[PDB]
Amino acid sequence: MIHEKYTEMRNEQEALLSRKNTKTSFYNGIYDRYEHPVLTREHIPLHWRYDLNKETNPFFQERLGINAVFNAGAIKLNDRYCLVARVEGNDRKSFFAVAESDKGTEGFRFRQYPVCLPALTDDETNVYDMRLTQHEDGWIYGVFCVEKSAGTADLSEAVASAGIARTKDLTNWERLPDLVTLRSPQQRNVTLLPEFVDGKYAFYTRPMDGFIETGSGGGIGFGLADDITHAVIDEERMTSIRRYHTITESKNGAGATPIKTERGWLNIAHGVRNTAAGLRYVIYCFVTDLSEPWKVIAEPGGYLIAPFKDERVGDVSNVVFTNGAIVDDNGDVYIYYASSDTRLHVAVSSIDKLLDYAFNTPADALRTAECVKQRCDLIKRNIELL
Amino acid sequence: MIHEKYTEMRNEQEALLSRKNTKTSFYNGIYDRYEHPVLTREHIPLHWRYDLNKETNPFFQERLGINAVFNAGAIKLNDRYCLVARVEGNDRKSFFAVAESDKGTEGFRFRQYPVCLPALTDDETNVYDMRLTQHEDGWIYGVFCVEKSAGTADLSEAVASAGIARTKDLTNWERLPDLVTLRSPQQRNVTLLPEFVDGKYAFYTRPMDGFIETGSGGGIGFGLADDITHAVIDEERMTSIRRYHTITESKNGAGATPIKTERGWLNIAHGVRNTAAGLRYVIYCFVTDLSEPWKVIAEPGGYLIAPFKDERVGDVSNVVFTNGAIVDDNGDVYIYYASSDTRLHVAVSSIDKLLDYAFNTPADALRTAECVKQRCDLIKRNIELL
Amino acid sequence: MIHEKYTEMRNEQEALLSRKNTKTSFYNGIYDRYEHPVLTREHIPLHWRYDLNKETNPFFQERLGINAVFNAGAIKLNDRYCLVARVEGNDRKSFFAVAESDKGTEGFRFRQYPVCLPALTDDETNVYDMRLTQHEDGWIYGVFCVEKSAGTADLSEAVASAGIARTKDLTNWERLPDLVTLRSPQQRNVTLLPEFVDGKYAFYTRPMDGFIETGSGGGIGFGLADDITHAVIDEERMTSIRRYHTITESKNGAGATPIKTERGWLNIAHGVRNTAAGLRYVIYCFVTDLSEPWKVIAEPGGYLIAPFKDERVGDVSNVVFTNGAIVDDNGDVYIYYASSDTRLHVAVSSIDKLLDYAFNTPADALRTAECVKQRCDLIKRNIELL
Q: Which of C330, C333, C318, C199 lies closest to C270, judged by CA?
């Protein structure tokens, strides 16, 4: 009852869905880039898009297209690499779907169905950018962006909030109430630390007036929540603050979930600046203190990832954006950054490498003269070698 | 009296001007894409650009360059495929020029001269995006955008209007007065149906306050004109309306001229949304009622064409835009969409295919949860097959 | 004391740093384009970026990255082609560095250190787009943009000014006070003519309210300065003025330093227009009068260079921008235009070619009808040949 191109297409998918990934000539001493993305719109199973019944669909047309899969939460569940990816269909709404692999640089395959998540309100128009936390309390939390319309004359005006839901398998989800932030009407780039702080749940947040425009409101705020089941945040202490003429000028916020090291919380975050061609996103790093995570103790100058070569172009071009990372027990680190809001790539590093960077890469000299002196010094002691 | 590179360049043109076009591996069950565009700036004849006289131009330089040819009206005149293309020169003004072929996917060649069209006013700065209607009244109408300056401090501020002119050969044009819309100071994406409605001329329009910003003013309005020779439209009834978080959020409007089918008027239109990198244009479809063309009876969720691969980049990137289509007698359909305001491509479909899409592709579920359920159902009945 | 990838990387650089450049099939009768850029971020010496000491940098990571090198002043010092390039690091600040060659289309190599330039104030955040003038007074002046923050709530709000500094070798620089313009709070695209005018120093300027938005304020103004050591400009006489629906609509300004010919000052300048995808920059030309440089005597319609093929994409895409040019004694001309604020290319022409263009390429007909007639006439006298 098939229609018979299906067999052939299903055959080409499998070839892509198993396509071997290779490392690129790219070097900087910190991470490695790879030739192919780990997830594309081509990766979504065809029976999520096509109706294979020959009677109600005779030409064999795509009934529900996928436009993009990007910004993806990452977590290692048991011994499989799990990517809770943001999948965007042709209708512009995004939803979550899990993809699994055993190598982390290739072989990712979506599950049987996409992720089901109870709407709390009925004006929840779409959800995105989930960050995954394997907390010490036993659960796995997904904290994600919830976008609703503002009832205004401007059809484009929408309000953003932060929603929380818990799982243990990634199939079943318990939708907890949305996080409340009392000194901030909207929230973006919210994420939960894997450990308690003063016997409470710890968040990184971005307070803001709403919703394209950051408020006052300098950057990434640290907040404590008494109970996650009814999460409330009265204060948000400032950590990474945006600075004029840095990589953070217009915006900045958390990316991958905080990663615990012996020297502190490694936050692979993102910064936004305004350019003549629109907004430019890049991926930078910063380390906060283990016993005091509101305290930035490492913060290099500039960025770690920027759009590079064919990463430059997509639906929202000159954007790189990480939602999540995977840390192996031996020291291996996998960073899942999307490019141009169209595809998901992988960058490979280690804890010691990523810690070498941030403590030892020089902080921002902030002004051209001091920057020149800063570079001159390095040149001056590289020549006092040969 | 030649200068003698001309012979060689004229020889390479002919090779491009006759270059065979091939179909691409692209599939979705609805249309086919092709390897090469049907018209580029390279297609314009060199004696429109170069002065071949060796005395007044010794280095053989280009005196009047072409920067782009895009958004093109389409009509089958006699048995030739005719493309009234928008040609933009280096001086940023656009004008119309006709290109003809007998295959429709290749071999397009411009005429002897470009299209001459009487300015009605003397502050008509430029004209563009003509839609061609072979009306039942005998004539062929070109309804197009007329752009004038607003006498304001902002040099960029301009007013848009809709101009009409009739022909039978595409060489000679009778400029009729500009369409008047009384409940709307400006007009874009205006087009004329091939049949009468209540013994009158039928338009699709986009009412608007002006001119980058849509007013109130929800979308594509249907209007009746008593006489085309002095065209007046008092009311515009709303058809396709823009919706929050759809493909239409910021803007939307007509594309190719309405195409009559047995089930209704097939309108291949366009939608615009705001992104961090600027505005994104896509091509979608909707069907209105034969006896009541203000009544949308089919309207799928999402789009039909979006910028794809090297279509992504040009002078105004991430734009696809159709001005016109060509329908053969047997059922063949040719859609002429431009990419990034630089080149004109072709998409090949049929009436029954394009009708399968729009009636049977699911309408917009509007919110992520309902979208997920909508996709889940399809997945659930594709598995109840194998 | 080396770490030993360095030797290998240093070996690949040398191959790029010596890579032969070839001419492209590109033709228009005026300039030639080349296959490779003359300067990239790959061109910067690795000991400006890497710490080769194995003890303080064990993984051999890049400590001070380069994100781009673009908009470059050009001057022939003795018999070497010198490019004072704008180098941008990962921290978003720009600085100047000199690169030298003997062919001008290839083989460019940076100096030992980057350019040292005394900050006059301590809130000078960054400097860029230096134009180089070998004046008749003996010196070489660099007039460049100085960007400071405005002490406002908007972190993005910055004020621009024009700074001057003199040299004879390009290593040592005497920072003179910033140019004062009394009828204009900010200045961009300022440059100095190589000759005196009425026994004074002659500037082209762009007066402006600040700083993304041009004021009133029509375009490129000519100004006279009594003494360069304390440079003051009371009046700026208008030359090239921006016009609605031209290549100059939103912005325009000087590019390469004025080039003296027998028929006038050849100014290879730039124009900016607003598009749905952001701002579009192109390179155009105009000639002013030798004894009266505020008087435009040649000004063709449109542009000379626009973003082409892979020039289209970078950090600020659809931008071409020249800072400087090199004129040989025999008639050879080298134009150093950057693309998309990422790389620096070269266009090759001659004085007589570039003079043929501007006097003989038709001026702007300003409106579509007159443009069509203008092109029609040329077509009409190209056919009255064969």
A: C318
Cis peptide before C211 (omega within 30 of 0): yes
- C-chain CB neighbours of B149 within 8 Å are 244-245
Tell me how many degrees the CA angle C180-C185-C190 measures, rounded to the nearest 5.
55
B249 backbone dihedrals φ, ψ, rounded to 5°: -40, -60
Q: How far apart, in whole angstroms, are the C-alpha atoms of residue A73 and residue B107?
A: 49
Beta carbons of B191 and B288 less than 8 angstroms apart: no
- Closest to B369 (Cα-Cα) out of A148, A39, A150, A85: A148
List the chains bordering chain C where 3 or more Cβ pairs fall under 8 Å.
A, B
Q: Are C172 and C147 in contact (CB under 8 A)?
A: no
Residue type, A25: S
Q: Are A317 and B317 in contact (CB under 8 A)?
A: yes
Instruction: Name the one residue in this structure whose structure tokens are 């004038």.
Output: B148
CA–CA dist A318, C69 (Å, integer) = 18
Query: Could you tell me which residues come within 8 angstroms of residue A328 by beta carbon, excluding any fewer than 6 positions away?
Result: A76, A334
For B220, the token pair is 């594509």
Report phi then psi at C380, rounded to 5.
-75, -30
* Solved using: X-ray
Asked if the Cβ–Cβ distance from B30 to A1 is below 8 Å, we say: no
Residue C161 near residue C178, CB atoms below 8 Å = yes
Angle at B179 (CA atoms; ends B173, B184), nearest 5 degrees? 155
Q: List the CATH number of the domain containing B153.
A: 2.115.10.20
CB of C333 within 8 A of CB of C354? Answer: yes
Which residue segment(s) compose the domain that C210 sits in? Answer: 1-386
Q: How many domains does chain C contain in total?
A: 1
User: B277: nearest CA in chain A?
Assistant: A278
| Sequential DSSP letters for A245-283 | TSTTSSEEE--SPPEE-SS-EEEEEEEEEEETTEEEEEE
A378/C51 touch (CB, cutoff 8 Å), yes or no: yes
- Rg value, chain B, Cα: 21
CA distances from A280 to A218, A251, B266, C73 (A): 18, 10, 39, 26
- In angstroms, the Cα distances linking A16 to A45, C119, C265, C268 are 11, 55, 59, 50
Contacts of C7 (CB under 8 A, 6+ apart): none
Q: Please give the structure tokens belonging to residue A134.
A: 């394997």
For residues B369 and A124, what is the distance between their CA atoms, to the nearest angstrom?
A: 8
